[PDB]
Amino acid sequence: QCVPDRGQQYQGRLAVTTHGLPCLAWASAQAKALSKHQDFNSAVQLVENFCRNPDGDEEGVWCYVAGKPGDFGYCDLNYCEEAVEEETGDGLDEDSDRYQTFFNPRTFGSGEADCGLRPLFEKKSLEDKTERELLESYID
Amino acid sequence: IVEGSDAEIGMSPWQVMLFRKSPQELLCGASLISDRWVLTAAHCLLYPPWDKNFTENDLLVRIGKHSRTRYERNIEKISMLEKIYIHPRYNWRENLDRDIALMKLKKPVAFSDYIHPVCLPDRETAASLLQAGYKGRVTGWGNLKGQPSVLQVVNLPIVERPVCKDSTRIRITDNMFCAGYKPDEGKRGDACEGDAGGPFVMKSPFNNRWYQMGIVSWGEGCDRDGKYGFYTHVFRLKKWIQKVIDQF
Ligand SMILES: *C[C@@H](O)[C@H](CCCNC(N)=[NH2+])NC(=O)[C@@H]1CCCN1C(=O)[C@H](N)Cc1ccccc1
Ligand SMILES: *[C@@H]1O[C@H](CO)[C@@H](O[C@@H]2O[C@H](CO)[C@@H](O)[C@H](O)[C@H]2NC(C)=O)[C@H](O)[C@H]1NC(C)=O
Ligand code: NA
Ligand SMILES: [Zn+2]
Ligand SMILES: [Zn+2]
């Protein structure tokens, strides 16, 4: 009966969303386009036009429905588990795969190494009116 | 901004304002993360429920000293957009999940005392600063329904997901978080529709750098009791940002 891992293991043939929309092919132009910049789990087989959850969306399996941004829908499977609602700072995956730099200067441009240090304050050891309130709140 | 104070000069060198060309019209706040890359909410460029579908050549960006209006020398710098990148599964039909867009500048901008980029957080910074009660900052134009002369700054505490959840009938996700004051904390404050608040930022105590942890995303009215502004969870969306940029 019920379906674990919010659909991450699903291999069924369900090809219609919850608004009754027909799933487009994973392999179609408009779908490959919308997938370029996303981070899919390779384990998850993008077969035909079947609702999968490749990106671990905790809402569950979905599929492209048209080609413009937002043109996707979820699909009704019987999940055992409503995903455990993690807090804002919990379950935060790792980004490194290695201040330290994250981006590539060729495409990003300059400024990363220098980011977030303000020339009229942190460069000149001047506090701003309110920044006290922030640093006060970070103790507890 | 509602219930904020007076911003100082170059307090927010990353603050970027977005304008519609014809007619000259303020749309949203944004942040400069490099000499050429600008982070903003998807909902500023795309929201068909309101017939809002902006593109590169309909939009203008202003950066730098917001012109302390003593009608003495203007240096708010004007830039144009090469490319817009809306998150492909920006769930605009439902709950605005992944409310994030990138904008590439036509011409890379030069850094000054008034134009400097904000940091995008690493794993340890996000784990450290993303706690209920920890305060972040939004800067925008004050609300008396449009814009006043002087930039307003407001410091809001991050809220426990449970109180966020129990405060609205919209489906909230891991890709959002809510900030502000609970009724009878005393202190109030919020961003609002049109103040161009843009980035929610926090000052690392470990290296004294300002990081962007949030983007103004959605709310239900303004500065309400038992209501909280919702902010796009930037860190949890970082891999998308990296993939658009590193593959440009
Ligand atoms: C882009 C901004 O003008 C604005 C930010 C509002 C922040 N408000 C507070 N109180 N901190 N965004 C919006 O107005 C978004 C975009 C589309 C509608 N919207 C809303 O906030 C609606 N009020 C509520 C909503 C509608 C659809 C989906 C989710 C929430
Ligand atoms: C937002 O803007 C433009 C309107 O000019 C739309 O883009 C075009 O859409 C048509 C089909 O409707 C295609 O034939 C064109 O090739 C598209 N051009 C580009 C540059 O994308 C776009 O679809 C609109 N988006 C929404 C959500 O309505
Ligand atoms: Na409130
Ligand atoms: Zn989760
Ligand atoms: Zn719906």
Cis preceding-peptide flag for B121 (omega within 30 of 0): no
Cis preceding-peptide flag for B23 (omega within 30 of 0): yes
Q: Residue B48 Cα, ligand 2 centroid: separation in angstroms?
A: 12
Number of H helices, E strands in chain B: 3, 16
- The DSSP 8-state label assigned to residue A44 in this structure reads S
- Burial of residue B25 (CB within 10 Å: 0-12, 13-18, 19+) is exposed
- Burial of residue B10 (CB within 10 Å: 0-12, 13-18, 19+) is buried
Token pair belonging to B143:
């609300």
Q: Cβ A86–B174 below 8 Å, yes or no?
A: yes
CA distances from A75 to A49, A112, B182 (A): 12, 40, 36
CA B230, CA A71: separation in Å to the nearest integer? 23
CA B88, CA B70: separation in Å to the nearest integer? 43
The CATH number of the structural domain formed by B13-117+236-248 is 2.40.10.10
Degrees, nearest 5: CA angle B132-B135-B138: 125
Q: Residue A19 Cα, ligand 3 centroid: separation in angstroms?
A: 34
Distance of CA B44 to the CA centre of its chain: 10
Q: Cβ A37–B174 below 8 Å, yes or no?
A: no
Q: Does B89 touch chain A (CB under 8 A)?
A: yes
Which string of DSSP letters, residue by residue, matches A46-100?
--TT--B-TT--TT--EEE-SSSTT-EEE----BS-PPP---TTSS---------
Closest CA to A112 of B241, B134, B129: B241
Closest CA to B214 of B199, B229, B202: B199
A-B interface: how many C-beta pairs under 8 angstroms? 191
Q: Residue B91 Cα, ligand 4 centroid: separation in angstroms?
A: 17
Token pair belonging to B14:
């990353």
- The DSSP 8-state label assigned to residue B16 in this structure reads E
**Which of chain A's residues have a Cβ under 8 Å away from the Cβ of B238?**
95, 102
Q: Cβ B34–A112 below 8 Å, yes or no?
A: yes
Q: Specify the 3-state DSSP secondary structure of A134.
A: helix
- Single-letter code of the amino acid located at B6: D
For each of the domains in chain A, give its residue range(s) and CATH number, in order of start. 1-84 (2.40.20.10), 85-140 (4.10.140.10)
The kind and range of the H/E element at B46 are: strand B46-47
The kind and range of the H/E element at B71 are: none
Which string of DSSP letters, residue by residue, matches B133-161?
T-EEEEEEE-------SSEEEEEEEB--H
Q: For chain A, how big is the Rg over CA atoms in Å?
A: 22
Q: What share of chain A is helix, strand, coil (3-state, %, to 5)?
A: 15, 10, 75
Q: Cβ B129–A72 below 8 Å, yes or no?
A: no
Of A35, A91, A134, the CB nearest to B155: A134
Q: Find out whether the beta carbon of B192 lies less than 6 Å from any atom of ligand 1.
A: yes
Give B96's contacts (C-beta < 8 A, 6+ positions apart). B42, B43, B90, B176, B217, B218, B230
Q: Does A20 touch chain B (CB under 8 A)?
A: no
Q: Does B129 touch chain A (CB under 8 A)?
A: yes
Token pair belonging to B128:
């450290």
Strand partners, B234: none
Q: Find out whether the beta carbon of B18 lies less than 6 Å from any atom of ligand 1.
A: no
Token pair belonging to A100:
């330290």
CB-based contact A24:A65 (threshold 8 Å) = yes
This PDB structure is determined at a resolution in Å of 2.4
Technique of determination: X-ray
CA distances from A40 to A19, A26, A44, A77, A98 (A): 24, 12, 8, 20, 20
